[PDB]
Design a protein around this ligand. Structure first.
Ligand SMILES: Cc1ncc(COP(=O)(O)O)c(CNC2=C(C(=O)O)C[C@H](C(=O)O)C2)c1O
Ligand SMILES: Cc1ncc(COP(=O)(O)O)c(CNC2=C(C(=O)O)C[C@H](C(=O)O)C2)c1O
Ligand code: FES
Lengths: 460, 461
């Protein structure tokens, strides 16, 4: 792709600021950071409307899998036979296209997690998780009622939002979690107050997620004890909510908590959590919406746990272009029209995804993520050694890396400075800086960032 | 743009469809699948399946295809080299919009904004449209109550752990028979069929009766007036009841025509009065036009029939509009960013297509066409109703948004099955209703193609 970044103005520049003013008329546009020229963007480089070309290590909140304007995807749109897929969107649940199954074989089914033979598609991460919740609730009621018909009382009360038709079951989630913002998802989200405030919720159990101490090899015992404490509280919560007649039907967790501030835990913790879930008859729901797609060095991050039975349900979106969830055969809905909506994804996204997965495989991009990520993490550890007054808790897996700054203002200042220097970084939590490079992020991009950021720290 | 009429080769689903349905059933419950389709050969009003059957489609992918299959104007868009990026570079629209984002909105959604609603946020589907409409309404209501006070310390603390006062116990009032989506917030306001709701945790929110009109309308003028008045009273009683329960109604959601519940209509007067009740109790009035929106009732938005300068506070849309989202009044604008947000907030490629759809709707006078084609369709249905009272009752509609009842679910399903094999795709709704959702290039001559086919079916039934 491009050789390096190229800056012409401060960001946002005059043209971005004019467009931001226009947009702010019709909606709150305070979140916009600048306007983009995607036609001129290529690979790891994002071009804005003021002609600035920045190395993008945020990749549209970790949703761009193989870079901007990838030539393989360009070729797809150029093919006359693919026109119909872009302009004839089906109600997939009732009238799928002829190639629906074969395109699924070329894409999502070719990367199915272990033990999960079932797949339903969805259009985003939020309806992926919402429908995973519903799939779990249905499965749990199925266990309880066995091979029996719905009762007349259930059929009548569910229509008016009452038990027993509408059970008071719960999903257990973790502090620091982010699972989406529709009202079901939002109940399991515990990232920032501004995400949650003034919105009605569910009285569902909330467990602590381990806060590891760094550097890791100095706090081995403390961290295992921290993880042990959290696992105990999960089990206590499950028991407590069963007593409250609010049975925990499932547990949802991210393999790495993203929006909450890139919180990591050992593979051992997740294996033990998986066991706790099974032990109490809770469905284990793993949210790979952000970790999925290969940046951790394996296609799904949970693959690092080395389990033949990693989970019951697994959701995905972002890098996968389409959303959806894999699940075990036993979680298959017993009747149609229970897990359903108009579009259930989009065949055009499946078309693109199939080519993305082909590229990832052909070009060995999973291995590349591991390699480039190590270069990045090693460099971050060096800068942490050299600038302890600015950098701490350097952590990561693959390119999925992050570190903390002393406070929020410094975090924001560093991001602002880096952006004007031609590097786009993301923030998470109060004072963390995170990396979500696309999968065509290579060694030399890592070296480029490190050398730019090193100069930034020296001048800071 | 065109085929002559339907052309059938096999029963539906045919052998190739049944084979593909068998394959799909391995990886997921595929019992809902009607058949597999050849969209490449589908054109205008006609859906072609994998067995070569060509059917007149009066269901239009659950009322979501706006100007028919493989429209040449949309073909042209995908063919243009300058549009490639829009299809393969999907932005996080909330933070990094494309250069043409505002202008393409001016060409599309903003050019059909409802009266009194200066604000617009885009969403990817009807469910997240309604969910975020709810949230916008909750934040607005809380903002009313705390005035200029900042977020209290207790609110900021409790909201992180799903507790009041940070998470208020406010409610959205909805109607029996309603359908607003299936995510857990939406679902609480949905009251369509049991199979949609059963075994899913819900919210204790007020549920009002939706008027059940009696037909023919001109023979039940007094009764229908009284029915609507009854429902309006019960709406108001519920708001008061739930205020005392400390589960304050922050908003009221309603469809201008109930779809999935069984194509239930109500007078323009009813909705005007409901709007007034909403305002009176300080509830936001949220109109769900996900299915009624996009022109099939003869006006772009169905609520336009009401004739109000202030028709609602918030209005959601999707399906025919290609993208979802919601218009709303300025006073409902979120005070801070990242409260109404998600990764994609729609998709610029859908906005690209929608701008051209809206261009076609205006240039080909398709709003007026829907009113005309719909009148022809309805007149024919009323004739079949007079000729076959053993099978057809309560013929009703506005524009092409038409429907009628059959004696029972068994007969309803049989008629749909026979019609499909005779080259016409129909939809069902409610217990025993048959509904029509033709695309906007449905013409009076397509109405007659259907009517003549269905007339022969009824004669042999
Ligand atoms: C782990 C995880 N689980 C679910 C979601 C929701 O996906 P979607 O934004 O609804 O498509 C997401 C989306 N993540 C988002 C941000 C990051 O990541 C920030 C965005 C936000 O809503 O603030 C959405 C997610 O990361
Ligand atoms: C009035 C109204 N309000 C909201 C929605 C939800 O839209 P979406 O299916 O989430 O894109 C819809 C979608 N309608 C659906 C059906 C029709 O028919 C059937 C589909 C279903 O979920 O069963 C969804 C709607 O009609
Ligand atoms: S909720 Fe996922 S696209 Fe609307």
């Amino acid at each position: 792709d491009y050789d390096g970044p190229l800056m012409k103005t401060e960001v946002p520049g005059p043209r971005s600021r004019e467009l931001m003013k226009q947009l702010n008329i019709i909606q709150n546009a305070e979140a916009v950071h600048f306007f983009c020229n995607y036609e001129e963007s290529r690979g790891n480089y994002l071009v804005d409307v003021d002609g600035n070309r920045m190395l993008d290590l945020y990749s549209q909140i970790s949703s761009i899998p193989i870079g901007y304007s990838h030539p393989a995807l360009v070729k797809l749109v150029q093919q006359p036979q693919n026109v119909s897929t872009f302009i004839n969107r089906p109600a997939l649940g009732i009238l799928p296209p002829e190639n629906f199954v074969e395109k699924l074989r070329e894409s999502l089914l070719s990367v199915a997690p272990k033990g999960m033979s079932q797949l339903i598609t969805m259009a985003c991460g939020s309806c992926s998780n919402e429908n995973a919740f519903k799939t779990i609730f249905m499965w749990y009621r199925s266990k309880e009622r066995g091979e029996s018909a719905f009762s007349k009382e259930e059929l009548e009360t569910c229509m008016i939002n009452q038990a027993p038709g509408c059970p008071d079951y719960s999903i257990l989630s973790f502090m620091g979690a982010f699972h989406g913002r529709t009202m079901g998802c939002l109940a399991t989200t515990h990232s920032k107050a501004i995400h949650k405030i003034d919105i009605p919720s569910f009285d569902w159990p909330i467990a602590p997620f381990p806060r590891l101490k760094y550097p890791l090899e100095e706090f081995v015992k403390e961290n295992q004890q921290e993880e042990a404490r959290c696992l105990e509280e999960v089990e206590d919560l499950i028991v407590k909510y069963r007593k409250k007649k609010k049975t925990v039907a499932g547990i949802i967790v991210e393999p790495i908590q993203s929006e909450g501030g890139d919180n990591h835990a050992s593979d051992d913790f997740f294996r033990k959590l998986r066991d706790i879930s099974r032990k109490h008859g809770c469905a284990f729901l793993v949210d790979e919406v952000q970790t999925g797609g290969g940046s951790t060095g394996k296609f799904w991050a949970h693959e690092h746990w080395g389990l033949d039975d990693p989970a019951d349900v697994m959701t995905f979106s972002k890098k996968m272009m389409t959303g959806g969830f894999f699940h075990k055969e036993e979680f298959r809905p017993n009747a149609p029209y229970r897990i359903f909506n108009t579009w259930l994804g989009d065949p055009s996204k499946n078309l693109l995804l199939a080519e993305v997965i082909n590229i990832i495989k052909r070009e060995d991009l999973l291995s590349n993520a591991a390699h480039a990520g190590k270069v990045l993490l090693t460099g971050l550890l060096d800068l942490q050694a050299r600038y302890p007054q600015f950098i701490s808790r350097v952590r990561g897996r693959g390119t999925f890396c992050s570190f903390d700054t002393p406070d929020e203002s410094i975090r924001n200042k560093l991001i602002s400075i880096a952006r004007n220097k031609g590097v786009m970084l993301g923030g998470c939590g109060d004072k963390s800086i995170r990396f979500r490079p696309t999968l065509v992020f290579r060694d030399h991009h890592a070296h480029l960032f490190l050398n730019i950021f090193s100069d930034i720290l020296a001048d800071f």
